[PDB]
Design a protein around this nucleic acid. Structure first.
Ligand SMILES: *[C@@]1(O)[C@@H](COP(=O)(O)OP(=O)(O)OP(=O)(O)O)O[C@@H](n2cnc3c(=O)[nH]c(N)nc32)[C@@H]1O
Ligand SMILES: [Mg+2]
Ligand SMILES: [Zn+2]
Ligand SMILES: [Zn+2]
Ligand SMILES: [Zn+2]
Lengths: 166, 122, 99, 55, 49, 97, 98, 76, 39, 50, 86
RNA sequence: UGCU
């Protein structure tokens, strides 16, 4: 979770003039940035606040009200060392499929660093014994439109001991 | 649609929880049928993030407690990431600070752990 | 007849007509007479609002045949035009949404 | 077929010098507008026979 | 400034009318000029060979 | 088209354009000469300034800087003819604000 | 899950920068190479030849035969250019004085 | 504050056109129209009543700008 | 220039296009900012 | 004009802004005088002066 | 008359003449080795200025451990004009 | 070729 500065030219139709301008801008920004991953930024959750809002222009075309609004929004973007607590939403032979609680099923922990008893035989077996912890390692983003996903990240689980659960 | 700074300022989970609660109450007070039908992903993401934060121990927090915890940790020369993780996790056991918290070497001192536990539990 | 003079500076448009003129002193200086035949062909796109909803409903009910009326309707959701000469004009008028 | 009702009653009816393939059941305009040439455009297109264009 | 490649425009600039009434079609002058240029290039290549 | 037999429309000649300019009805002149006559939406790449298709720039082999733009079809034809004549018009787009 | 990409922007042209293209830029811009001097095929359908003049990969000019580069009709096709190499260079009459 | 206080015919036409377009796009009316089915007539009534919520942003050639309200300007 | 404006299909700078219009919407410039507790 | 066979053109705008600009700027009641010298052109004519 | 060609010429037409092999000798080998050594040693030279990294994520205790350290040469400000002093 |  981190704040990000953005400047958006929001277009409000003429039938929304009876509503408050700031509330309409906030609603439009939320609807535009709800469940979308901005490249090199992360997945935006919602709008935090609006800092600067200059004059509202009306173009000779569509005739709506275009406003250039400066705002801050919350995005989920770890700092390459953040610790998280997720739940195992499945498991694959090459690696477990853990997912943060109802947030995103994109965490793919590589099983190449635990103690030398690591293997998945497709029977949803996590690990042989001697709320799942996660340590983010690196981020990565990719594009979608390439002809006429985008956030997976790397997860680590060192020898944390885990006296509560093996 | 360009961004100015993706790492402007880090915030704990309490601020996100408060923002989500405010958005949810404003939504339930001024719900609009067409606005909701246009984009339903907003409702889903807000509800699920709020449910996740409720599952976490982030409850029973207040800005006064956050400021007191920050001022208590300022005397421990700990870094911003460490204090952010401690505030977001609220560790009740010692092992969570001994091993799970990074940069343990030379920072634990085997005497400051008790003070850290007392401050995070108070 | 070049691109600059015959296709950019001066170009042909639609929704226009050419007809002979005749005198008529019974009309104001700021008024001009238009024949029914040209009026039924030259159409104007009017947006359905909370003011002229009933007028547009009556025009749709009249249809392309009667002079006060319309010829096509473009829905707000889909941009597929609908010809009033075919289909139930009464249903089309009863299902006129804003926009 | 009609994109709205799925009917196959598509008739080409020109409405005041406007060629238009329109459904006869609901009046949904399927296609409209045809691209012709113009006389000066027609005059400046030269007549070449298949004996030369084909090869 | 010295050209070695000619940019043949799309077919939108070169309208072609299929005159089914006879065994021929109406083509613009640009198509004929490009055909002549290609023929001359082929003839030059043949003479070089 | 030109003639009435071929269902032709009227021509707003250079004199009509001059009269409209003298009146100052900018929106009326725009609606007459762009919207109601040869309205079209093209795709222009913001990197090279060339004309794309279906939101794709074949020159740069990318589609991130391609954006839609309203332009007369006659103007697009003029741009294409100039590009054929090796006179390449490089369009540098920007926000309307 | 989903990436944020802007649908449409109210882009306004600022100015037109005229210029010229090198043969390499012409090759990069063009899609196919036109080498056949003929127009149509020997069959009675008189279909346009491939890699030749009047090819449908460089746009379309008929309401029945759509463009091959982009799967759109004539009303929606913008057209595509092509490059034709010359064995010997020639002076550009427009730029001969230059 | 240095330009002419009178509202020119070009400004009148542009404001009336913008208001008519907004009303045709289902904008709220602030004059309580009485059977006026023409958006241009409604815009003219609003202009005569001095209730159009539009502010003219006059730009000087150098780059400066000044805001003038419809109710603040003088009409003829 | 007016000629290139007409050619490109944009409103000419002369006439009604010399100035710009603004909407008199009920708003509040520089709205109150939510205070940051952690920072 | 002289009503001896003149063919005149009639155009219908397709935009509210264009309609308003035409009515205001190109209004007959507002263009009763020419900008050349201010003399009124829309006035009485034959069969009215007499 | 010239025949018509259906397909375009190959993008890389074949040639019956091949490049002459490179000169062999201890001199050429030593020159190659020295050029490789220069390539390897000039990148780490202080004159090889790299792109200044920016937009750091966070500050950590391991910053002092991972801090890149390299001696910087001092230019001759007597010979160099005054417009290049930091 | 006709029209004002
Ligand atoms: C008339 O006797 C001749 C003279 O025509 P031109 O003006 O010499 O034709 P042009 O020079 O080629 O004019 P443009 O360049 O404008 O096209 O030609 C016949 N004729 C010419 N034009 C017309 C016409 O418009 N309509 C008709 N019916 N006949 C025309 C005449 O016999
Ligand atoms: Mg006459
Ligand atoms: Zn149908
Ligand atoms: Zn490009
Ligand atoms: Zn195409």
């Amino acid at each position: 979770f981190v704040l990000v500065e953005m400047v958006d030219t929001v277009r409000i139709p003429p039938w929304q003039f009876e509503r408050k301008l700031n509330d309409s801008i906030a609603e439009e920004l939320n609807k535009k940035l709800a469940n979308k991953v901005v490249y090199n930024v992360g997945l935006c959750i919602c709008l935090f606040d609006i800092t600067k809002l200059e004059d509202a222009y009306v173009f000779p075309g569509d005739g709506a009200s275009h406003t250039k609004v400066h705002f801050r929004c919350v995005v989920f973007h770890p700092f390459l060392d953040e610790i998280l607590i997720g739940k195992i939403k499945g498991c694959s032979p090459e690696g477990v499929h853990v997912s943060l609680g109802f947030f995103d099923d994109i965490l793919i922990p590589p099983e190449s660093l635990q103690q030398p008893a690591k293997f998945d035989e497709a029977e949803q077996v996590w690990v042989w014994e001697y709320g799942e912890e996660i340590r983010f390692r690196v981020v990565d983003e990719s594009f979608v439109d390439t002809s006429p996903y985008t956030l997976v990240g790397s997860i680590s689980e060192p020898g944390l001991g885990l006296l509560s659960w093996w | 649609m360009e961004v100015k700074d993706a790492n402007s300022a880090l915030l704990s989970n309490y601020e996100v929880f408060q923002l989500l609660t405010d958005l949810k109450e404003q939504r339930k007070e001024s719900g609009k049928n067409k606005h909701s039908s246009g984009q339903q992903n907003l409702n889903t993401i807000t509800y699920e993030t709020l449910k996740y934060i409720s599952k976490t121990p982030c409850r029973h927090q207040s800005p006064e407690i956050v400021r007191e915890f920050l001022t208590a940790l300022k005397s421990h020369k700990l870094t911003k990431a460490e204090k952010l993780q401690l505030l977001n996790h609220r560790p009740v056991t010692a092992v969570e600070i001994q091993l799970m918290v990074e940069e343990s070497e030379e920072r634990l001192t085997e005497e400051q752990i008790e003070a850290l536990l007392h401050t995070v539990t108070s | 007849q070049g691109r600059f003079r015959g296709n950019l500076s001066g170009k042909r448009v639609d929704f226009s007509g050419r007809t002979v003129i005749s005198p008529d002193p019974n009309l104001r200086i700021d008024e001009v007479a238009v024949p029914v035949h040209v009026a039924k062909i030259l159409t104007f796109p009017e947006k359905v609002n909370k003011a002229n909803i009933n007028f547009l409903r009556k025009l749709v009910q009249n249809g392309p045949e009667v002079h006060p009326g319309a010829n096509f309707i473009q829905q707000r959701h889909t941009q597929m035009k609908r010809f009033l000469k075919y289909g139930n004009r009464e249903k089309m008028a009863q299902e006129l949404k804003y926009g | 077929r009609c994109p709205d009702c799925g009917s196959t009653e598509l008739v080409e009816d020109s409405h005041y010098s406007q060629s238009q393939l329109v459904c006869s059941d609901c009046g949904c305009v399927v296609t409209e507008g045809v691209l012709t040439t113009t006389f000066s455009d027609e005059g400046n297109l030269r007549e070449v026979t298949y004996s030369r264009s084909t090869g | 400034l010295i050209l070695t490649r000619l940019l043949v425009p799309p077919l939108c600039i070169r309208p072609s009318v299929v005159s089914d009434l006879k065994s021929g079609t109406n083509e613009d002058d640009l198509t004929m000029k490009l055909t002549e240029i290609i023929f001359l290039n082929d003839v030059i290549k043949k003479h070089r060979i | 088209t030109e003639g009435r037999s071929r269902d032709g429309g009227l021509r707003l000649g250079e004199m009509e354009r001059d009269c409209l300019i003298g009146y100052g009805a900018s929106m009326l002149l725009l609606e007459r000469l762009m919207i109601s006559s040869d309205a079209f939406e093209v795709d222009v790449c913001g990197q090279c300034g060339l004309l794309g298709y279906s939101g794709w720039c074949h020159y740069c082999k990318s589609s991130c800087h391609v954006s839609s733009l309203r332009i007369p079809y006659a103007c697009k034809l003029l741009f294409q003819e100039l590009q054929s004549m090796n006179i390449i018009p490089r369009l540098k787009l920007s926000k309307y604000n | 899950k989903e990436q944020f990409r802007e649908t449409d922007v109210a882009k306004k042209i600022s100015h037109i920068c005229f210029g010229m293209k090198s043969p390499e830029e012409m090759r990069q811009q063009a899609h196919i190479q036109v080498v056949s001097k003929n127009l149509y095929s020997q069959d009675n359908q008189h279909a346009p030849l491939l890699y030749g003049v009047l090819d449908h990969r460089m746009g379309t000019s008929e309401k029945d035969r759509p463009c091959e580069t982009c799967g759109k009709n004539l009303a929606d096709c913008l057209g595509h250019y092509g490059y034709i190499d010359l064995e010997l260079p020639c002076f550009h009459v427009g730029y001969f004085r230059a | 504050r240095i330009t002419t206080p009178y509202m020119t015919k070009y400004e009148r036409a542009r404001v009336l056109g913008t208001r008519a377009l907004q009303i045709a796009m289902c904008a709220p009316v602030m004059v309580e129209l009485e059977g006026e089915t023409d958006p241009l007539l409604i815009a003219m009534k609003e202009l005569k009543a001095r209730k159009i919520p539009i502010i003219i942003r006059r730009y000087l050639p150098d780059g400066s700008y000044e805001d003038w309200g419809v109710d603040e300007l003088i009409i003829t | 220039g007016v000629s290139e404006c007409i050619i490109m299909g944009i409103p000419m700078n002369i006439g009604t296009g010399l100035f710009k219009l603004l909407h008199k919407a009920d708003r509040d410039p520089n709205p109150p900012k939510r205070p940051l507790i952690f920072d | 004009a002289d009503f001896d066979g003149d063919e005149m053109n009639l155009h219908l705008p397709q935009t509210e802004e264009a309609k308003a600009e035409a009515l205001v700027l190109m209004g007959t009641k507002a263009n009763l005088v020419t900008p050349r010298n201010g003399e009124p052109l829309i006035a009485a004519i034959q069969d009215f002066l007499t | 008359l010239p025949d018509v060609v259906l397909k375009p010429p190959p993008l890389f037409p074949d040639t019956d003449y091949k490049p002459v092999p490179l000169k062999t000798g201890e001199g050429e080998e030593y020159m190659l080795a020295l050029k490789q050594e220069l390539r390897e040693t000039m990148k780490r030279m202080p004159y090889f200025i790299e792109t200044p990294e920016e937009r750091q994520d966070i500050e950590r205790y391991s910053k002092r451990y991972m801090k890149v350290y390299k001696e910087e040469w001092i230019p001759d400000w007597r010979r160099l004009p005054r417009e290049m002093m930091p």
